[PDB]
Design a protein around this ligand. Structure first.
Ligand SMILES: *[C@@H]1O[C@H](CO)[C@@H](O[C@@H]2O[C@H](CO)[C@@H](O)[C@H](O)[C@H]2NC(C)=O)[C@H](O)[C@H]1NC(C)=O
Ligand SMILES: *[C@@H]1O[C@H](CO)[C@@H](O[C@@H]2O[C@H](CO)[C@@H](O)[C@H](O)[C@H]2NC(C)=O)[C@H](O)[C@H]1NC(C)=O
Ligand code: UDP
Ligand code: UDP
Ligand code: NAG
Ligand code: NAG
Ligand code: AKG
Ligand code: AKG
Ligand code: FE2
Ligand code: FE2
Ligand code: FE2
Ligand code: FE2
Ligand code: HG
Ligand code: HG
Ligand code: HG
Ligand code: HG
Ligand code: HG
Ligand code: HG
Ligand code: MN
Ligand code: MN
Lengths: 700, 700
């Protein structure tokens, strides 16, 4: 048994990037002892992500190996740091190195890089990996010193080509006992073997398994175009996320705060924008520390922004609006907003937030700042769907692709802070990162690609982690696909696409509590029920939408009412079918009226069928009342739409068979009474002003 | 001005028949002085109604004229008595006789009788009647004596031929100044001038007018085949019936009573016969003075007669039944019943009463006896139609014909006791008339004609008046046209043909009082109404008609009920459509349920549409209860059909939304509740016996 204290891990890292700090955490988890070479110098190895290079690593290693040139007692493993995570203990590592019977064991991959012509000089291996990879090797300190001493080349010369030619020496291969980890018992290179690697979970740690050779490797190396696939594995291995302990680096359980530059973007006609602008005042963060930027590209929202701006300017420390007259594209506006924080040393954090993002958690800004990340984003999903503000993986064309754990994250099966290749809609960026690591202005613009895809690619090219947190419920995304903007109040027609937001704005706030009972629903007349249904904003926008139509009912209008022996009981009304709002009102009946009816009438079941839906107008100048009659319906929904006293003086409904009078109608409330036989109801006269009501004859 | 005291009316009458007593009343009305010849002797004039004769009249007249042979001061008018009524005063009579300038004025007719060949010897008249009629003449006593003295012929020789030949003497016509009343200024002969005579009404008397000559005759003579047409006029002229004083001889305003022979005839399957037999016990007349005869020709009524016979035999003085086994035709049975009174000197009055006659007036037998007629009949009309138990006139074939005043009598515009040519169904005949005037037994039988037509013709041939009284409301006639006798209770199907009798037998006795309000209808549950609808006999015969069908509902029977979200709420029931009683029950809903619904639910209007009508059976052995559900109807009719306690132990209906229970159903009563939404009703379990209910789902 080789003593673990005789093991030394040597790596090269010119800066403490996120990939390096991720490597060190996996090393400190297994109690490895790591010596890092080159933390202060600059990288002279060229552009190793693009072409050949990395000779500066061997030069620093040769200088380091001169102290251990005669140390036969020391085992030394050299691995990369930016794209390597450790999945195994030193004891298992040394045990597997002894079983190999090699004095210097290199890693093996599927490609002969960089010179493909040397593929013949390699020995024939049956089913394992054939060629050498310099990204990770382990061996005796003396045998390594006899190899790394021969390096006398430029800093920008390929390091793997140097180790390959020394391995391809048949004599030197036999003398020093050089071998390649063919079946990935210690080193796992991902390039060319992506389908071979899967995760293997345990109670409090995670490893990887090579299903092609049935091995549990120790070193996971994301060489080449597999850096994203390693970020996926790095979210778990070794203790990134565990089934019993949860994630390992997130905050989980949670005097001036940092100054923030909030940047709102309205790049398309967005529903419920006045609700979004009113929510900016409610974010739980000291507003005197927030500087607001807002870019509105739509002229449809200029009145919305103007109504909210006096409150925004008085709330935040500073505000600035860039309206549609500047003719700014989405890429140019996001560059400008981000650069305003970059060029200000007082901007400690940058918070971009699109208009279609609804922040239900008012502490979102704090939560993301406490996570202490460079780029972190809150998880926002479309209500009841898998669509969300992040991607789990990329296609070969760097477009969308579903990751193996994408659904587990959206459904919040596994919770934590995840390294993901794409974020959007909302994210918090550290101010230092914008000045030190992405100082250029062309972050979103520059190339013919989506400004949002270029923003994420600009951070991946610099080795920045795009974090995504689903540790808490942050909010949801709106549906802006087909937003019909040609209405006096287009948010009324948003009951299908955004029902959760439609309910908060239009349905009465006490409706849901009334549906659960507890003494809200009243019974003013024997079989007439009274419950709150619509909000004051719903009543106002519906009345205004009717008057904006203008063409009310006059002579020769027939409503399905019953008086005496004829159906000649008219009203001055407008049907929902005339304004193109029939399907939208039927959906209100199915979702909110139907369930309320079956609760108040035990045994009755509705599908909320209704062919007669209309708004009645009562005025002393034209039809101020309605003579007694029956309704052609099983039950009738009678909803007021304005105030008694402020808008009209006059009675409401009167049921003759009971001598019961509804003399004081409530604005947002609704009446639910049977239409036939027992409820001969009469409309009391309106003496002053105008009285509006919404009425549907349900289940005829 | 000739003194009226010098006028003498001489007539011939061998017996005080009804036609003679009618003549004397018209004569005593105008204060005429009449001398009647031959009241004691027998008629030797032959058969004047068939052929020629009447010479015995001239012989008695010649003997009478010998005292007034020299009386120039005396005017004398000779007329018949059986077929003559006086319409004018003596003053008007003498005045018109003076204006004629004749010493002996004969009556004129349209036919030369008996010898038609003598029509040429008559003088030419332009437009009036040409030939002589011996039925009535007026002249001086001396001139008449010089004519009647020449009579020296047999008693059976024609009298008109004698007066005609004396008139056809041109010399004697000029000497004695003989003339004919051509234009009917005094004498009106009806034969050959029927269309010329109409009635002329006044305040307190009636006359006749000859519209062909515009005259008001004094003597109305029904010569030849016009005796019935005179009976019509005799009902008014002169004071028979007046528009201001009503009829003149009827009783109008009303110690042992006479003994009566009551004869009931059942010659066809008649509805409501048990009701008729129970009514015979209720006739207001001392039953110890009534002898009952009953002829039943239908075996269908043998059980009906047998059930009532113990009560009939114990009620009347004597009873006798002649059932269907005797094989008696209707003519033979009516001859036998009438002859049983004829051959009994203790039978003072004979009362025939058919089965289809419903006597609503319990004092009918008294009323007709107080009228003191030979043959009188109470007026009975089909309900709401003109069909009744009498004819107003006859056709030339002695079949039915409508008289001029037939509709005024049926509708009781004119009321009184009327001389009509035909009666049926019910009539009272004096016992003396059967012994003295119609002693033969073949009254109804004998000739190939209807036994009812031969009965009336047998009385007209003897000069008997067939009286008909509509002075009071006596009753009605049943409809026995198409009586479907193939049912366990055929009177259930009699709601269309005899609705007034159907209502008294089957509809609850307190239904009509409840329909007028006044605290009979109850409201046990908020919108559930409780009123009496059916009688105990209706419930019993309907249940028995269901069990007589036998095929109740078991598995896979679906009634239009609503529970949860399916219509799978069955019952053990039988629909009215299965027993051929759907149309009959729909008529009950329209006539009796509908009006009750519109009274209890002000504003609702029904036509009593119902596709689901059925009788439910609840038993502990099969389906003792019914789980909560709704009904596919606007309102539901729930009628009990038996007694709680005597037939079943178990609850009734339960409405869950009100916690109201109908624990004690009433047999003939009905429940009226809405079917949808508010009345989730549940059928309580039947613990013992059997529970029947009738239920209709009205207005679906
Ligand atoms: C919904 O219900 C709540 C409580 O039932 C209402 O809150 C009350 O509102 C009245 C008038 O605005 C106040 O006088 C009370 O003090 C409130 N109660 C509480 C506990 O705050 C609320 O107004 C209802 N919503 C609407 C739209 O009427
Ligand atoms: C119809 O109503 C009358 C009166 O409302 C009922 O007559 C009463 O009947 C009860 C029980 O039979 C007697 O105790 C009372 O004395 C009766 N009242 C009178 C004034 O006679 C009659 O019973 C009802 N008919 C039915 C079929 O129930
Ligand atoms: O600017 C640099 C670039 C490279 N490296 C080190 O050189 C190694 C080679 O980089 P890379 O993993 O991208 O090469 P590959 O494994 O893809 O061949 C990295 O792991 C780093 O440890 C460094 O320290 N600074
Ligand atoms: O049995 C008789 C038949 C005849 N007459 C009298 O004779 C008259 C002639 O009868 P009738 O009127 O029927 O003859 P017609 O007028 O039809 O020629 C009657 O009016 C009676 O007054 C009579 O007294 N007894
Ligand atoms: C690492 O070493 C520490 C001693 O400082 C020890 O407490 C811990 O259990 C070790 N962990 C592993 C995984 O060896
Ligand atoms: C008939 O004579 C009586 C006298 O007894 C007289 O009272 C009556 O008015 C007279 N009637 C007529 C109609 O002449
Ligand atoms: O004004 C009212 O409440 C009665 C109007 C009504 O119910 C109807 O529209 O039929
Ligand atoms: O027994 C009852 O009264 C309930 C039965 C009923 O209402 C039905 O037939 O649906
Ligand atoms: Fe309308
Ligand atoms: Fe209404
Ligand atoms: Fe049924
Ligand atoms: Fe029912
Ligand atoms: Hg190579
Ligand atoms: Hg993006
Ligand atoms: Hg109202
Ligand atoms: Hg003649
Ligand atoms: Hg008859
Ligand atoms: Hg009941
Ligand atoms: Mn690498
Ligand atoms: Mn005559």
């Amino acid at each position: 048994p080789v003593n673990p204290e005789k093991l030394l891990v040597i790596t090269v890292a010119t800066a403490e990037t996120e990939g390096y700090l991720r490597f060190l955490r996996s090393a400190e988890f297994f109690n490895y002892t790591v010596r890092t070479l080159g933390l202060g110098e600059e990288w002279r190895g060229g552009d190793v992500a693009r072409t050949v290079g990395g000779g500066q690593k061997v030069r620093w290693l040769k200088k380091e190996m001169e102290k251990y040139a005669d140390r036969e007692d020391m085992i030394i493993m050299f691995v990369d740091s930016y794209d390597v995570i450790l999945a195994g203990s030193p004891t298992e590592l040394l045990k597997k190195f002894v079983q190999s019977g090699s004095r210097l064991l290199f890693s093996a991959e599927s490609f002969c890089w960089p010179e493909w012509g040397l593929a013949e000089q390699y020995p024939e291996v049956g089913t394992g990996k054939r060629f050498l990879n310099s990204g990770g090797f382990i061996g005796f300190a003396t045998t390594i010193h006899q190899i790394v001493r021969q390096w006398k080349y430029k800093d920008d010369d390929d390091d793997q080509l140097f180790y390959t030619r020394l391995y391809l020496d048949p004599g030197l291969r036999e003398k020093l006992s050089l071998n390649l980890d063919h079946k990935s018992r210690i080193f796992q290179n991902l390039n060319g073997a992506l389908d071979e690697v899967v995760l293997k979970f345990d109670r409090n740690r995670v490893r990887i398994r090579n299903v092609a050779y049935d091995t549990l490797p120790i070193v996971v190396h994301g060489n080449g175009p597999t850096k994203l696939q390693l970020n996926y594995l790095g979210n778990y291995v070794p203790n990134g996320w565990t089934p019993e302990g949860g994630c390992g680096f997130c905050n989980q359980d949670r005097q001036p705060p940092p100054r923030v530059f909030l940047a709102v973007f309205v790049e398309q006609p967005t529903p419920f924008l006045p609700r979004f602008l009113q929510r900016l005042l409610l974010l739980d963060y000291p507003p005197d520390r927030v500087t607001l930027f807002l870019h509105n590209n739509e002229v449809f929202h200029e009145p919305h922004i103007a109504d909210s701006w006096p409150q925004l300017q008085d709330h935040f420390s500073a505000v600035k609006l860039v309206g549609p007259e500047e003719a700014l594209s989405p890429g140019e506006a996001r560059d400008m907003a981000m650069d305003l924080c970059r060029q200000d040393p007082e901007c400690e954090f940058y918070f971009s937030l699109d208009a279609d993002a609804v922040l239900t958690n008012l502490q979102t800004l704090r939560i993301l700042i406490e996570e202490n990340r460079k780029v972190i984003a809150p998880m926002l999903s479309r209500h009841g769907k898998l669509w969300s503000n992040f991607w789990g993986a990329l296609s070969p064309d760097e477009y969308y692709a579903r990751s193996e754990d994408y659904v587990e994250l959206v459904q919040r099966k596994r919770v934590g802070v995840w390294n993901v290749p794409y974020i959007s809609q909302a994210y918090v960026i550290r101010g230092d990162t914008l000045r030190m690591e992405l100082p250029q202005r062309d972050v979103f613009s520059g190339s013919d690609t989506d400004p949002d895809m270029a923003f994420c690619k600009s951070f991946r090219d610099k080795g920045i982690f795009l974090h995504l947190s689903n540790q808490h419920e942050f909010g949801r995304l709106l549906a802006t696909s087909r937003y019909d903007t040609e209405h006096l109040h287009p948010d009324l027609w948003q009951i299908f696409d955004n029902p959760v937001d439609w309910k908060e704005q239009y349905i009465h706030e006490n409706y849901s509590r009334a549906l659960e009972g507890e003494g809200i629903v009243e019974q003013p007349c024997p079989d007439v029920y009274w419950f709150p249904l619509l909000s004051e904003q719903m009543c106002d926008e519906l009345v205004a939408e009717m008057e904006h139509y203008g063409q009310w009912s006059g002579g020769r209008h027939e409503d399905s009412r019953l008086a005496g022996g004829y159906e000649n009981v008219p009203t001055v009304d407008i049907h929902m079918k005339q304004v193109g709002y029939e399907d939208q009102w039927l959906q209100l009946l199915r979702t909110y009226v139907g369930p309320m009816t079956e609760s108040l009438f035990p045994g009755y079941h509705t599908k909320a069928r209704a062919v007669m839906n209309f708004v009645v107008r009562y005025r002393p100048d034209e039809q101020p009342s309605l003579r007694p009659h029956h309704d052609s319906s099983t039950f009738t929904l009678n909803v007021a739409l304005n105030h008694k006293g402020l808008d009209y003086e006059g009675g409401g409904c009167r049921f003759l068979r009971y001598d019961c009078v509804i003399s004081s109608p409530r604005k947002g409330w609704a009446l639910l009474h049977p239409g036939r036989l027992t409820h001969y109801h009469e409309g009391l006269p309106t003496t002053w002003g105008t009285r509006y009501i919404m009425v549907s004859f349900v289940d005829p």
